[model samples]
Target chain A: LNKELETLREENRVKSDMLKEKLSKDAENHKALKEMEKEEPLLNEDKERTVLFPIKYHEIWQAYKRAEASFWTAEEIDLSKDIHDWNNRMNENERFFISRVLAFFAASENLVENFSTEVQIPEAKSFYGFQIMIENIHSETYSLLIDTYIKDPKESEFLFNAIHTIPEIGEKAEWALRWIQDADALFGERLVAFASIEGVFFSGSFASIFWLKKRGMMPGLTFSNELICRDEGLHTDFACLLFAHLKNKPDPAIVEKIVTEAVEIEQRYFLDALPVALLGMNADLMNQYVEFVADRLLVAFGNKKYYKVENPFDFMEN
Target chain B: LNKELETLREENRVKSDMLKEKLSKDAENHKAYLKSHQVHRHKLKEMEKEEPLLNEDKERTVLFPIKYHEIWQAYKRAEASFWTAEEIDLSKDIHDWNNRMNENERFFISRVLAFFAASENLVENFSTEVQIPEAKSFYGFQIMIENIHSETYSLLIDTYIKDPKESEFLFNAIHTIPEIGEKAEWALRWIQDADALFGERLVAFASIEGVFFSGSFASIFWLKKRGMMPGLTFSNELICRDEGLHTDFACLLFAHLKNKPDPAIVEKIVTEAVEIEQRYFLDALPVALLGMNADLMNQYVEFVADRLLVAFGNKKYYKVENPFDFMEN
Candidate 1:
């Protein structure tokens, strides 16, 4: 509004505020008309209060669950992006590997966050909140890892933009909500095809890259693996909870289809990324490394506990 | 098969233990395999190790709208029957209520104990473990207050029910509650209405009395109570924590979902509270001690409801201003 118009409107509001002053007088008049009270005429009470609300209102048991705390930061938090020395630059292969993981993390975040929004059950809401919060932190954790390591701005943005900007991949994310959104999976089966490309293949290939970075690979960041490791603990839960909850839910037929779709996607992604990952991943150890990491993801989610993969704990403190 | 069967069982037990050990080791191996190549590195070093440079924006993808991250329908539905610490709430002056009726005071005090236990088991857990998870991180944090609830009630019991001899009876009455476990499991089952009338009576009382428990306000009205500990010997430091904020959260979740709310959930919570109440009454007391009848209990439910509606923005579910909440309660 114009300055004068704004002033006029403010004045009008002030006038309206003044108009209510006689409300007490008006109430007194109404009171006088009714006169004296005898037995309160009738007992005044709420009907909703009478409507029996059945849930046990236990306060103490709910407290401990609320004490649990966790955080999420991106993998890109402390990465060196300088290219003055080409050797300092993040390799294209690493870029390929990191973005794929980011896409997966983003998808998980989207899934859990949605559950947080959609669930109305107070009991279930508590669970979903922790689940989604952890997933969000995972997204940040992975993003920070990438940023700390990936130094080039163009390459970094390109890596992030590739999976997110592509319109087609969105459907895959929407469809692959796994156990969380089973009804959408008829089409999600098709979307599962990408997991092999984004996750199974690339994430596995990148696991070695992260290992090399950490386990004397290039003297990688301190606490990166541990944080990621902790997240991996939660990450596994994310997928597992989805699978388990769905398994426990009705329409059991959807389980096998979800299992099949997940497996197929893993196999294909691993198979597709073998060409590039093999160069960095070493073909000799390819069989061992690929299967091991695949098992890691699976074991993290407790999907299929295959042989050969190592599952390290983040120790007690980390 | 009897004498020889014992020998066979011992042999089978030995075999089973060995197999269990082997399987456990195998699980450990799988865990180790996944952990072996794990990269426990800092952020900067990872960037330094990469061999070739790549395009940055090439992977800048939006992925999806993520609209799903924001809806809290499931949590909303669950919030209707969940309890907060305020449900088991009361003021500390136990002696004052004794004047209302000396013989009945123990029964009245036990009713508070039932609220403390029930709220701890039912609403708080449901909000923290169940509903909070569905509500997502942003909105889910509120569930922690339910945790605040359990603490308030523990303090409540410590303060009131002061006579040790009488306290034991109150506890026995609580423990004698059939087909229930330690507080948590008992509440879980109770909210589902799997428990009987004993549970329901507590529900009827706490959920109704809960409506007017504003600390200093609402005194003009009949329901001017605080957490069960306020008037008791227990330190009020913790009881003070059950402030307006604690009360607001449950009230918010409840009033919103009157209709089309989870009927089964509502039915369960009401049923459980009812059963728990009736059970506590039967276990603790001799029947027909007062003129207050079962029918009066139903009437009190509506009578007590009037206070709740006013506190909660004039809720419409109650048919009358002076609802029969008092009679039913």
Candidate 2:
């Protein structure tokens, strides 16, 4: 009995010692990892993808949590009123403006969805996944708008193919796709280009939506746009944060160039889409708005504002 | 005003006619794409080498003209099934962990948790590495779901384990426990060959989620049936459902390949995975907790491997009968 008790004691002692050693090793490894994270660049092209924990970037994680909290499906929004307004309350110009915006966004959302795959950082990758999901939701929102508002299959077909049919929109997509294609080689430039897309191009289109909303038309579509706008705001903020963390920052000239190019695309699309401008929204005002948004993007990227134009639709601030 | 309205009507008709012509041309182009791409009968090896799924393309950014609508549907379904770990109540689990569960059961649960806590993230990281557009989109949802899963495990540990040191051990069990480490190494090995061995990688991951995860899931459900840990059981059930979709999607991808993975290679992988799982379960559960035992889990692993193999459109490698009929529910 005494020998048996001693054997048991020894076994327990050995097991306990083994566990203690493991715990100590774990603490040491964790400490090392925390130290490594301190030096970890946001875009470490050398680092392979892995778990995102002990998150070095609290801001990115916070953005992800906020995005998760703000989740909504496009189907949840009631578009019946928008459908009625489209069939009864709108004219050809208004319809053209709305359809052109929706068409541009429908294709553009997929383009931006590829951003998640381009990133090398683990936290950024995870956040990009959330971004991709939200982008899909936005795409689905456009689909819902198109399918709900347009009853004519012919028009539906036209809107879906507008990326090709509409030269301005096609040019914008092609420009964005060029950056997206070269994202692997020029990630910083790609990010700057997308930030400009989210900040300049999307905000410009959204101004049109809110303008229509100000006139009390398509509140349902406006609500969806508001949701998409909130998501894009988060995306732009994340892109800017990622830009700030780039180990090899792109040239300020390149940043200005991308933003400027985005501004040009936005101005052209709005002008082409709105050949006959609606009330309070014209070619000049839209161009100014695009420039105004581009300046904000430039400031976000830590560059001097070249446009120096004020927001034409200050009412959008409300 | 009448003359202006007439001019507007004439302009609208011309625009409409132009749009109609564009739509017809788009249709003809699509018909040509359908013939040339043959995306409907997606035999990966036989299809054009530059197809989106098999090859990377820069111009193929849009999800329109969706060649694989089922994958798109899976993405939608996964989005609809969104959930957060906080929604589940773990209060019961805390009580049961402190007062009701025996040491053996707790150890078993901890081992399972350790494997999953690490495994989910590994899958998430790998999901980001995929270049296929449809698959990448689905994996985007998967990345979110996997994050939720890792959070679920953390929640379980924080609520139930209580002791910080013990919780640390549980998290580190993936490295400390040889059997658990072996399973992780198995996953990592396939992930290392992620680019070159894409098909094998899918088969490996499909088996990981489909076949390897079954034993742990069965153990959790077993405890739930015994009225032991209902909260953990509920969360596992949700995870299990997500994993089912993941497994199906992986197999769907594999099954679509015309140059399917060698059945022998798949058989060897599944067989090795089952062996690793058997060793882990046996090592984790040294003694039988009532009706559950390592031998039973080994059989369960083999049974599930057969199902996964069949789902991948391969002949069954294992003819083992299911030992845990209670898990069918």
Candidate 3:
């Protein structure tokens, strides 16, 4: 297993003056291709060069195959029942919170989709694009939910505006996106935060899906988010893989601090918007769930847990 | 055509204080979904302030939607350029690899395969990650093409190479050759640099598409000339043709981005990327094995480099003529 690489490593150290001595001739060969057109043998054999399976490859190949297999679309899910439910059963406060949350989800998806380049390496661009398309689907899901259920133009305007006007929600998004605005300072932190959001914020936020499913309500956003969560599961796992691959000696303490800050902010977000009176969801359970999820994220990064709570919502595991 | 986007931009400026007052009460309403578990038409009427009256002749779709035209055009090209690795047939290539080559030839071909394997991965991931987000729809096609390209190499490897050595070959491909490793790190530095602006990517992508993709022409050309792996060479040629269209679109995207507010940065990115590629190209020449003429190859690389720079609407990095007239087509 190790002998070949070891031999190759030893061979690599033996730099040859042979390469240096031949430099002048090497330059001439660069242009030798076209000149070879006159050399009847190579030109005549051009048909051979067009053959299939010319060479070979490695594991990065599997990554693309996996992505191709995971194809999906938003249009596949129906939203008619969700529209009827929104019109008949939901109260103003329930609509307000759900609307605001959806609005934020839309804005954040667009932000992540747009500013993704700040942290990527070139080879991985296609995978990022796959995620971007999914992000668009997430954004579209929000738009579909808005357009289908809440038909009033003025009320919809109010919900979309909350993305910018609200402090806790808007500012937290700014914090997550700081990875883009000041990429150098926050490179490691941004990835850590993203993994936190993807694994923790996005995952815990799926609490809304369960809560909505529990009582018959906006099944449109619920079903859409359920699909979004499936995609997000892959996103989180892949993000963690890439994050580990690219960390290249990131500071543990700094990663810890970033996670701490992000988790603290999320707690603030949940506490402030506890759907206690607005819905049947529990604030303490939501907070505990976030904490437990945050700990799981820490463990993925080879760090110790910050909170020791069991999963407050076991229904999410399946 | 542009009026809708322009109109949206104008409306974005009118920030509302109505947002500020609504924020405090907003949290109170976040969980209100539980309260509404059933449907009521009167409540629905209260919920819906209006309905559009039936107009039988009217079209349903909103007309003249806002769009970013240049971005959309590049996206269209990408969709048109779709090809897949599964489409390639490699039985001849596999036979050629086992029967036709010596150890030295095998080593040389392996290195090139490794280079492309890693390069394509970086390309696929980065285009999908960073570029697609900003480049939007255009970058989506770029990523999938890269995915296809990356997979082609694997299909080649999985079909031809034995298992135990396969992973080893890939692992060593990246780092065993100092010059090859240097090229990887050199390309990585630009992407890692936060300061590497939009212009830098244009030059970099073009170099990848034009010079790097075309750089291997001599090696494959020689191999085919020797009546070596015909299948491999053909696949390389197809890959090259695909790159040609990509390079064209990249230049258009480059110039479109270059029109924005970073003229000086654009100029600097060109010189820097060209310099890096030159150093890498010079180091990569395996004169001992290929027996290629170093002087001509140097001139040839400089020729391709100049062509790439000019294609992106930048002046030639090296003021050399195309002595070979090789790439004129």
Candidate 4:
């Protein structure tokens, strides 16, 4: 009877060990499932560029595809008419206006190009890759415009130097450049800065170019600007998308501060650049437009409209 | 008469002061002209497409009137070459993996996938962190391409290997397999050299793309040629074309640099790449298949390294002929 009891005890011990092993494996699997249940953030600095699949951010991937489809080269546009207008038709003020606009854009495009390298998320980086390319092309287009239209070496040099030489324009550039150079700035804040630059700062210049286009001036330049603006619009949309999706949204106060500062600089730039109004564009109109765009940008970020001003250039609706 | 003389002297003094002021203005204008001339010279040098790959002055990172037309063209071509692995029908590959592919073929493919799945991520990290402002567009495209390649490998893993445990093992192979780990170590070494110039990293990456990848590419093509995995073959062909362009692009970039990489280092990188590849391939496949073996792979790796070295304007180190002429097709 004792021997029988010992054998039963040994068999029970064996079963117990097997059960323990099985339970341990089950616990590991449960832990793994728990880990998988946790989704990665939309933008993570510590995250590696791997793990692209089971895409957590579908909008970002879609933006990347949309950007791919929107590829247009500056070389494809003909600058003959722009050259003719600058040499034969446009007056000195018009030339100055165009030159200053181009110089600001040329400098700003490079300032924004580094945005691609700053992001750690792969999906965002992929979108930004296209952005960098587009920005490069924009820079190239400006160079093409400057080289093709401004035939006089002296004037061309002045236009290129205007970013540094003109204090008002230089201040505007410095405002954007300072944000870009801020290494400790939050990624969301950086995105806000970029959105502000694309949405707020570029509006007056875009309206000016489009105004020129409406008057049937510099068709080539206008076409390039249209393409560039389309891209900038897309970039702005992406930045806002990222801003909205942030795990820890940037402080609303900080967002307001950036937009406010951007609007002020932009207003100042317009007031300085167009001391005397163009045919349809003026300092007062641009100031209102800047505020108008700022409100739209603010709304896009899910914030209240700060300015509540109407877009002064009704023709820019198109 | 005395009053008239004094008035004439005052007028002469005023004339002398005016002349001195005029001379000072001329001197200032001359200095400005000289400064402008020097700036013009500097700008002229900067305008050359052959400027340093990494511009110390971040302000000059404009990508237009491209001095390096080939690099620009490469960016354009890469943009046109956008693809996704999901488009590939891996049904046949799935069938082959389950039935036709023997243990060795399965091991070889999984090993290749394992190395590549991680390597592309490494490449993407390097491309994003390393600022080649001159090739900004190309680097952007490259980052996207690497992401695509990573996704392709993931697709292959998820679709080809249905068993969850097996798929997990294959993904983890890069860390588990010592040979594969060593290859990654070699790449990560250069990639981590954030302080190194574009040429050094370019050569290291060129070797990774040109030499190390060729063996697995050949293995995949061999399997496809033998009617094993048609789906993987097609996807790899696309990848191969992209990688070929990348290798050529790197060589072009290296060629245009004001300061080129050391030839001895280039040779060492390529040779070491070949050795690591041989070790990995041989480890993955201890026994030879019908026509593909580690020995032939070694020869092919050396052959590819030689071609890469020549492309970088360095003399061939291996001096071996192409072992797999069928791969040329």
Candidate 5:
């Protein structure tokens, strides 16, 4: 580390050009060693020996490996502390609105999970297997949240039953998974359809969970939904990568229609669910949020951003 | 864990009563903890058991987690079984292919080699795209093996069948043969429309390995008997050994799931699989036979069908005696 001090102490090096030349050659050898280390990625060796792997797609595999490390179960987050809070936290209006949000998400998660395992799992690329299982975990997380918070077993059943009773919720759930039933659609079409649901629809609506947490309510639900958000973010990235890799570009017109129609469906849900005056979120903010998120989703699919409003719940940016 | 035992031993008679109560309660807590941990372990253990068991940190080959340990072992064996074409010398085979054969025999060789090359390509593509993703852990290895098999065909062509036009044979054969095209298309269509039923795809895969690949063994033997194309023959030998393992493993997987199937699903997988294999193995064989025919090949195909149906826990779909009795090892 003290090269100058060491050089002064070196009697032979101070008097001789021989040592200086040796040092230069030593440095040259070190440089060549470094260069040797910089050859084609190590895994690619013998791949052309007709070896299959050590090929491209390490980044996707890296993502799958990360998912493996990040895996968690509902057991880690204790809901015991939240049971008392759920009872005394807010007024009837807050309770009703939050419960409705939970119910919608719980049913919607069920739809997405079943849809993925059936339609996507059988045809998904290798690394996307983790993506499929993560969808199942999201559904399980919702169930864990519901069971932990809802006092009576009957009440939880009522909450789920209420989701079906809501026509807009039912309509959105059906629309998200309907492509599986469409025998005429190509694999790429169904993929885009599924991508729009995960990337646009669920991403747009689930901001309510983040907002609820930021507002200091539903700690149990918020914590679980944050995990869901992280998982969904990775899921969205996988879909985008697959869309690019599969080279299954749909018509630009179709892309516009999908984003437009997704936001429209979300907007209709807002109008149906709102008197606009109770919770931190309202009909107008909800509509604005969907439009803003829809624009972001369009950008994800490599299109022009259309909706120009600010993100209503801008904590998402943070 | 032995601390409790030591503490119990150290306590006197009066203290021992209280310690006994405490120790029993501790046992209850340990029991509860063990149960919960087992449940957690049940999910995470499968993933943890893989990759760290073999591969180094940088070059990751961690298997996707699934329920079946048996399936995982199949994958482990497969990953360990990797062999490269560079190891085999193909120089001698070039002479064997170009010089040592008749025109008709050469034609048959070209057709069989091209067909196998195309079929391996299909398997490689499907394994990476479909089967490896959905099936039990270790399917990545299965896909990798398929890729290795595909490259073997290219190696054969580059070394022995050096004509670039002959290299095009694989692609041309896939489209030119109606049955081959139909088989690939059938799989594509099935993936698009298949439901959540696990058995549907499981049985579909069984038919591919059991019926299609096994049926091709007829030609493999014909070339082997004539001592034609040693390099090509060795490649087929490796491919055949790999195919046999694949067929058996898929058979086991299918049988495991078929233990308690949905009545509707079972009916479809069984009925459609039977019909498709019959058409492919029985009907389509004659057209593709191209003057390379054997009565035993027909019976052997039927024998394979029967074995597959029996694997699925069904009665034999075909009544055929062992046609290869003389060659049975």
Candidate 6:
């Protein structure tokens, strides 16, 4: 009789625990739903305002595709959930780069979004007009993702404060550069890689959608895709452009070294975010994407090494 | 016999001039292609110098897909332009890929034309009275390329998607979007004067499509193909993401149009067929071009609802569900 009574008591305890957990989750889900709703407003009519995103080219579809967070929300498998929490995600030196990157992006977003949308920008001056507006939109997308999903808003804001401007880059570089020779220094190799990220990887991500858009997967933007691409194609030369500009004026050795060092760090950073298991967006693929992107970026600099890509298809079954 | 020879000589001179011009263009294009192609090699070396380009899992990633750099216009364009066709980059000597990466494959040549069109439009609609200094420098160069890209896409679109009806429609639609996008831009400024989000999103999407991905076919195929091959057609939401933001921009503008507004007062102005087509759906969307279901046009009112509410700031309206998100109730 006692044994049976004990079993009954244990079963009741288990049931009680499950019920409590269920209710907690339900409460959390409800809150999330409500918050999402709160984020939206209600109105009637066709429209009063229209968002003008940055890069008003035909390729906006690519950026548009990446703009959503539904993939993270809807996915049954979330590999990045664990990777996002990695210890190395933020290091002392890395914090410097990350902070600068974050601030630059945030400021850029604010600048573009505000300029494009905020200003009445003359009806005639449509180019900068729309570019600024959309850029500002993209800026917000990044800010929101960092705050809502990755880090606490306060903490992220704190990180942004760390790199407010030039003095900050210099200040942080001191300690970071001392122990971390690689992150501290730049190399040709690093810049080349940076060129890839700034040039190819970055472009390719958006280009993927942009390309589809061109194929009639989507429509063109306010500007012609051809024209917008022409404009941006030139900018893709940033790494090379900066390198050339500096090479002519600054230190070639340092430029190369800085590039090399940046390359190492950037590759490391990219490797971390790879979604190979499912998307096969692995290093090999990244390398391929870079090469493909480099194929375009290299035009301005006239130096390329796409063949050096190591195991460009390692993640895939091929 | 002398007269005949003189006539032949005159015709030969005219033909020679045309040939020379064509040859020069071909040469310049070739150079551009070679230059862009080389970028691939340079990028790989950069990868090795930096470290391995892949992570432990060997994938490319964005922990937060919303990283701002991903959306930087000038930055992305410069990167993509690196893939120009050899003929495009030729220096008037031999056809070459001066800066574009499409030397080996001429197909990339097609994208440039379309991309150029987008940039040109983006620049045209960006804003007349620019505020930010950053906008000036970046936007200037971005606009310049629109011309180059438009010509490029003209050639490309003519080559591919050659159906006259489809081709004509697309060209007209894109051009219209490029122009009408101005309204959204105005709405953005208006909202921002009040510091709003709806109008902002509207202008943002229109600009993104025009400026960012105009020349990126490979990139687009990569993402869509991933979902498409899976038979699930995942993230149809990607299109909606920007569209949602953009439509919201327009919706907000409308909400503010007050019943007493000058434009809204006259039912004649409100429901004029030609005007309605021109203003509302003239360049409303590129549903067919984008592979979106044409049927969605009917549901546009519903799809546009979320945009309307969000642009204004509160859900005071009794819209039950996203008309599209649920059955028509």
Q: Give the winner by DockQ.
A: 4
In order, candidate lDDTs are 0.37, 0.67, 0.54, 0.67, 0.53, 0.32
| lDDT score, candidate 1, position B55 | 14
- Descending-DockQ candidate ranking: 4, 2, 3, 1, 6, 5
Candidate 5 is graded, for docking, as incorrect
Candidate 5 off by > 4 Å: A1-50, A109-124, A173-189, A246-248, A274-277, B1-329
Deviation in angstroms for B307 in model 6?
17
lDDT of 1 at A41: 15
* By lDDT: ranked, best first: 4, 2, 3, 5, 1, 6
TM-score of chain B of each: 0.38, 0.76, 0.64, 0.75, 0.65, 0.29
Question: Across residues B67-163, which tens digit of lDDT does each residue of candidate 4 receive?
Answer: 6577777777876777766678887888888699876567667767766776633334444433454466676667656666877887787676667
lDDT of 5 by residue, B50-156 (tens): 42222233321112223346765675565455565556667777787768876555655555555566552223323322223224234534544554576576556
Name the lDDT of candidate 3: 0.54
User: Candidate 6, A296: how far from true, in Å?
Assistant: 15
TM-score of 6: 0.27
**How well does each candidate superpose onto the true structure, as a TM-score?**
0.38, 0.76, 0.52, 0.75, 0.44, 0.27
List, residue by residue over B266-309, the lDDT tens digit for candidate 1.
34333333333333323322122332333333233334343444
Q: Against the true structure, what is model 5's DockQ?
A: 0.02
lDDT score at residue B167, model 5, on the 0-100 scale: 55
- lDDT, model 1, position A277: 45
lDDT of 3 by residue, B185-270 (tens): 44654444343344455666666677764546655666766676766776676677677767776676655441332333344444
Model 4 spans with C-alpha error above 4 angstroms = A1-51, A78-96, A109-120, A173-180, B1-51, B56-107, B120-133, B156-166, B188-198, B227-231, B256-262, B285-291
